[model samples]
Target: TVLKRRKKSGYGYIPDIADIRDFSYTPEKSVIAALPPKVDLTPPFQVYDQGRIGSCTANALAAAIQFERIHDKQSPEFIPSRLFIYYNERKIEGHVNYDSGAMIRDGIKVLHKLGVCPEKEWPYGDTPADPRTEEFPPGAPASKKPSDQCYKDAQNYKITEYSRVAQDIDHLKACLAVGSPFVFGFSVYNSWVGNNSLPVRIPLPTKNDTLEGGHAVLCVGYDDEIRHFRIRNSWGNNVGEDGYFWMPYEYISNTQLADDFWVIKTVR
Candidate 1:
C-alpha cells in the first residue's frame, strides 16, 4: 500500500540561491571510521532520517554510503548518505516521472563528481542570525513515494555536467576514505511539522533557535554497537531533543531510502 502524499505546494521544486545555507562550520570530529579496518562488525544496523525534512534524501544516501563504508572499509561521514539520497531522489521524483526510485548505485555516481560535500557548504536552514531564502520553481512532479519506474531509469543515468563533481565510484571512495561529511537539504520547521514528531535524543546545543525556511544538513557518524546514526542538524541543538536525532538506523533501512526509491547515492 503506497502512502498518499497530501497537497503540499512547495514540496518539490528547484531551490533557488536563497533557499540554500552555508555549512562551513567544521564539526567537532572530521574523520569517522568506516568499519573493518577502523572497527569490525557485520556493519552497523541501518539508520533513518525521514519526514522531519523535505524528504528522506539525507537518510537514504547515508544508508547507501554507510553500506559502502561498512562493506568496503573507509572513513565516511554523513555526506555519502545525505547527498546520494537527495540527488538521486530528485532525479527520479523531479526530472523523471517514471519514479522507479533510488538506490546506492545512483548515489555512487553523484559522489564521484560532485564529491561528498559541495565546495560552498551551507548551514542547513534559514534563521535570524544567518538567513537564507530559497525559491522553489516547478521542474517535475512532486511525489511522496516514488514509483518503480523511477528506480529503473536511475540505473541508466549517464554522468554529465549535471553531476557536480567526483561522479565515479573510485572518487567517491577516495572522498570517503579521507573523511568527507555528506550534504543534505530540508526545511527549518520544528517537530510540530510532522504527523507524529517523536522526541529523539541528541547530544546538546539544540537546532531550533533560528527556524525559518530551507537549509542543508550533515550526517556525521553511526554507532553500530548502539544502533543509532549521529546527525548534525543546522538548528544548533534547540530543536529536536537536544540538537540532533540519534535515529534508529534500522527504521531508515526499511524505509524507501533503502529500497528502489527516489533517494539515490552515486559517486564520481
Candidate 2:
C-alpha cells in the first residue's frame, strides 16, 4: 500500500520563512562511513495519521520526538498531541485548516516554547473542519482552552535544540548513526506510491508530472548496499512496507526541487 499525502493544501505553501539560520555541522567522510553500514533507529511506537488535515509538520515532529524518548529508554512512552501542536500552530500562523501547511522550523519552535500535551489529553480526529466556520466539524474538539491550562499541558514535553543537516548523503547517515530520527521535507510525484520496494525518484519540479507543495517523513535508517534510506511515514501501516518506504539517497541530498530537512535533540 502506497502512503497517500496527508497534506490537503497544494505545494504552494512557502517554507522559506521556516528555514534555519546560523546552526551548522560538518560531518567527516571517514566518521560517517565508519559508523555503520546500516542503522534502524525507528522507535517502537504506533504510526500516526494526520487524517484529512494538513498537519504533516506536527505529526512528523511528534514522531521524531517520541523516537528520541524511546531511544533514551524513557518510561511511560508518551504520545505527543498532534492536535495540541496543530491548534497552537494555527494560532501562531494566524490561519486554520488545510491551507496552514507548516515547516520543520515552525514545529521545532512550537515544541520548544509551547511544548505539547499527551495524546490522551487531546486526541486527534479525522474530520477536517475550518475554525472559521460557525458550525465545527463533527466531533471537532474545542480549540479554546485557558492560557494556564495550555501552558500546563505544553510543559509535559520539550526539545532542547534543533538544526538543519546539510543536504548531503553522508551527513544524513551520520545523523542516523546517533539513533535519532530526523525530519525531512521533499516534493512528491505520482510515482511515490508506498507499495513499491524500489527506491523512489521524483522528477524535477519543473516537470509537468511533479506535484506542488511538500511532504514530510521521518528518516529512520539507511542501507548502504541497496543505497536507500528507510523512511517512516504517518499514513498508517497499510502503505509502503508497513507505513514505511525506501527513498533514494540522491533524492534527499539533491537540493534541486527543495531542501527542508532537520534534526532535533529532545529534552525529556
Candidate 3:
C-alpha cells in the first residue's frame, strides 16, 4: 500500500526535558579520526527509501540500530521493520497517521517497549512510482493498518538500551570513534537536495526567513581533515552520494537548524 506524505508545519523531534549535557574537551586541532579517515557504513544492507511515507523517524532509528548490529558482528544482519515501528507508533500515540511525522524520542519509547521486527517479517510496504514522489494521489487512503501478528513478530527483536549522546562535536566524535552511528534530526534546505560536493553548509534560520521542513539522517562517520560529518540518508541510493552525503560540522552544530542527535547503546 502507498502512504501519503503529510504537511509538516514544524520539526518532528519532541525534545526531552533533560538538558543536553556539555562535553568538556578541547576541539580537535587538525583531525580527530573516527573509524578511519573516511568510513562508509552503507554496506551489508540496502539503503532504505521512505517512498512518500513520512516515516523518516522510523527509518533513521532502524538504520542506526542496523549499524550497531553490523559493528557488533551480529548474525543474519536483517533489515529492521520501519512499518512495524510505524504501526505501533500509531497505536501508542493515538494521533499518528501516514502523513503526520514522528520524532526519534517517540521511536525510542516504542522500541523500548515493543521492539521492532525484521524487514522480512514486516518490511516497509510503501511502493511509490518514483523515488522523488512525496505524496500519494488524492482519494487514496494511506496504507492499511497492520495486523496483530505483525506486533507479535516485533517482540522477538528489541533494543536493550539507548541513550542521548552529548551534543558537543568533540563528544560526538568520541562516540563515533567507538563505532556508534548517531541518529540526528535537522532542517532541510533546497540547496541540500542533489548536493554532491564538499560538506553542506547552509545559513542559519532567522525571524524573517526560515528553512524548509525537518529531516532525520544517520551520522555514520566523520572526516576531521575535511571537517565533514558523513550522513546516511533514507531517500534511497539515487540521492546524494548513493544515499550518503557530508554535512559541515558547523551546520550540524547550528542551534537554529539542527535538532537533537541520538545513539543506540546496545541491542539484542
lDDT of each: 0.35, 0.68, 0.64
Identify the candidate with maximal TM-score.
Answer: 2
Considering only N, C-alpha and C atoms within 3 Å, which residue pairs clash in candidate 3?
none
Tens-digit lDDT track of model 3 for 28-136: 4443543355544455576788766567778888887687777778867888888777656656553434355677777877787887778776656654322354333
Error of 1 at 150 (Å): 26
Which is superior by lDDT, 2 or 3? 2
Instruction: Tell me the deviation in Å of residue 147 in model 2.
Output: 7.5
- Cα displacement (angstroms), candidate 3, residue 246, comes to 0.5
Best by lDDT: 2
Candidate ranking (lDDT, best to worst): 2, 3, 1
lDDT for 211 in candidate 2 is: 57
lDDT of 1 at 249: 46
For each candidate in turn, give its C-alpha RMSD to the true structure in angstroms.
14.9, 5.1, 6.3
Model 1 residue 149 CA deviation (Å) reads 32
In model 3, the runs with Cα more than 4 Å from the true position are 1-42, 127-143, 194-210
lDDT tens digits, residue span 1-268, model 2: 9665444432212353743363665566777768788998766786776665667777888898788777767767878887677667766673543345666677678888878877777777656545455233544552444246656967767777777887878888888886667887777765553233323433233355535447777889999888888888777776666777778777777786447677887654
